[PDB]
Design a protein around this ligand. Structure first.
Ligand SMILES: Cc1ccccc1N=C(c1ccc(O)cc1)c1ccc(O)cc1
Ligand SMILES: Cc1ccccc1N=C(c1ccc(O)cc1)c1ccc(O)cc1
Lengths: 9, 231, 223, 9
């Protein structure tokens, strides 16, 4: 998910 | 970590975490169905990036696991956008401030099939906030509540304790403005009941975005697609 | 007309106005569109009691007929569902649609799961019957109020009632305000289940499963 | 409207 990456960055 | 904070510390944490008000395209060209939905989709896509950074700065949200963070955001992302919209549209009666350069009325929504119903609901919520004299400190609490509450029963005990903290913050704000004991729990109730309509507006809005995806061309962001597919 | 009521008088009025717990046409002999048929029939008969129930809700009669119709059209499924999760409160992992119709998720699954989550949430909070009738009355008056200001004045009276109940339970001032908030936030999830449920019913009539004629009017009210 | 009828009496 793109949401995963955005939440980690 | 978020439970040790005072009500004042809670307010300051939320206020400072507030996302920026973004702008739409500056082309002043009568909108069409595709052009209007295009601007809104583009605007919503950029706002989501700032929402995620806002969410992580909401007290207690980092204490949640990555997947639990994903669930809460996937469930509430449109509610959070809409409550932001009606808050910005608060001092513009009969209008919706999507962006500072994108102020729309229901006549413009008539050129998009089914947009009027959702427009009227948003305008009603905004005027309700204006009638209640909703303060910014109350708004950031309400929006934080939506984030942690909307997906809490579709999975948590940590969240409920943070929800209790925000409630304490809301009462603390009302007692600070000189409200009586009765006026406090009455205003608290009034605010939270509006969250039910925000949910309703979001659900009705979610169907509209689903049908727009099936009708191809108002190109949805692939981030939006994942957010939409979650419903 | 109904603003001169005390908190205890409000509770008594709501309690005595409670609709009966109806039965389904369930026969353990017969063997899954049968379930929906039983639920559709059950909801159809419950609506008649709900209409007469709403009349006994303080302030509802003061509203015009056009407003009465609207509030019921918007909240009928919310009221049915909150009634269901209340009856299923003492039955963990099961939904008590009718005394003879107790269902688990195995026997739409996410609608069931959400209803099950709400019921377990009630059980954890130890929801009182006095708090329940307040919540059900709040839904009726609030769900369609945004499509005078008399309705809001009544809603505030119910809010005072809730606080008065929590005060008698021994909760602190902080504990009262927290519990009040917790209960009202559940109404958001109730609205959610209603909307999803309404969409499910919308696709069932087109597929044919046979809906009641009153239900078809309530369903088309959401367009 | 059936709802309107039943609400009247
Ligand atoms: C006004 C409206 C109607 C229907 C669905 C969403 C909706 N809200 C808007 C919206 C609402 C608030 C906001 O800050 C930005 C956009 C929308 C429009 C298109 C999208 O792809 C995503 C969000
Ligand atoms: C469980 C469920 C799923 C989807 C929609 C409604 C729904 N609730 C039920 C229901 C819920 C509560 C109740 O007291 C009676 C029926 C339902 C089912 C079929 C209908 O035609 C109308 C209501």
């Amino acid at each position: 998910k793109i949401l995963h990456r955005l939440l980690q960055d | 970590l978020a439970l040790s904070l005072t009500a004042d510390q809670m307010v300051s944490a939320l206020l400072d975490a507030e996302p920026p008000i973004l702008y739409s395209e500056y082309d002043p060209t009568p909108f069409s169905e595709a052009s209007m939905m295009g601007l809104l989709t583009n605007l919503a896509d950029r706002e989501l990036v700032h929402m995620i950074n806002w969410a992580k700065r909401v007290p207690g949200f980092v204490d949640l696991t990555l997947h639990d963070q994903v669930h809460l955001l996937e469930c509430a992302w449109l509610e959070i956008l809409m409550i932001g919209l009606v808050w910005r549209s608060m001092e513009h009666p009969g209008k919706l401030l999507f962006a500072p350069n994108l102020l729309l009325d229901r006549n413009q929504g008539k050129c998009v099939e089914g947009m009027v119903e959702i427009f009227d609901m948003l305008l009603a919520t905004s005027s309700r906030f204006r009638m209640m004299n909703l303060q910014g400190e109350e708004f950031v609490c309400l929006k934080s509540i939506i984030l942690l509450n909307s997906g809490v029963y579709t999975f948590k005990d940590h969240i409920h304790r943070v929800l209790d903290k925000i409630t304490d913050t809301l009462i603390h704000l009302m007692a600070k403005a000189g409200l009586t004991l009765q006026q406090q729990h009455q205003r608290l109730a009034q605010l939270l009941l509006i969250l039910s309509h925000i949910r309703h507006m979001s659900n009705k809005g979610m169907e509209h975005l689903y049908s727009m995806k099936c009708k191809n061309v108002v190109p949805l962001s692939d981030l939006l697609l994942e957010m939409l597919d979650a419903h």
